[PDB]
Amino acid sequence: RVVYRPDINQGNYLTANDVSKIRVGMTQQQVAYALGTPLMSDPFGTNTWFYVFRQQPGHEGVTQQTLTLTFNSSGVLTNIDNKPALSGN
Template sequence: MRCKTLTAAAVVLVMLSAGCSTFEKVAYRHDINQGNYLTPTDVAKIQKGMTQQQVAYTLGTPMLQDLFGTQTWFYVFRQQPGHEGITQQTLTLTFNSVGVLTDIQKRC
């Protein structure tokens, strides 16, 4: 009798573990968006020679600023749609000592 109970319990556990992995893929998972969402139109407006104030007006405040004295701003957007993989886009803007934009780098 005890053997039948243990076997039944093992079968139930196996079915539950298989069911959970299937359920995980069927269950709804909402998109997770973090950071600065920038449209291609907004990024196209940014040009070398703009001031920090002009860039902030166009794109908003950056997610990160370099803390070590260089004038570098980072606009980071991280997206995790439902059951898909994570994507990250980074726009790095470098300003000179006067606050004029000198370099633009985009990473997807």
């Protein structure tokens, strides 16, 4: 029913402005400095990062914006993926 639950959130915090800073052609170094460290990286396959801002305040939906930018062998960046919402509830 409706009893109680402490709020649940998962790391890699985000704003809605700095995500206008990062750009193509930048470095792993520049990006890592800009947005902090990617808490959830691609353990295998190609190197690729996953910045996910997911949050559950408990019994009131679940908010999550995620952005998992691509990369390149040389350690440079190629593409990004702006997922602001979670389709599917």
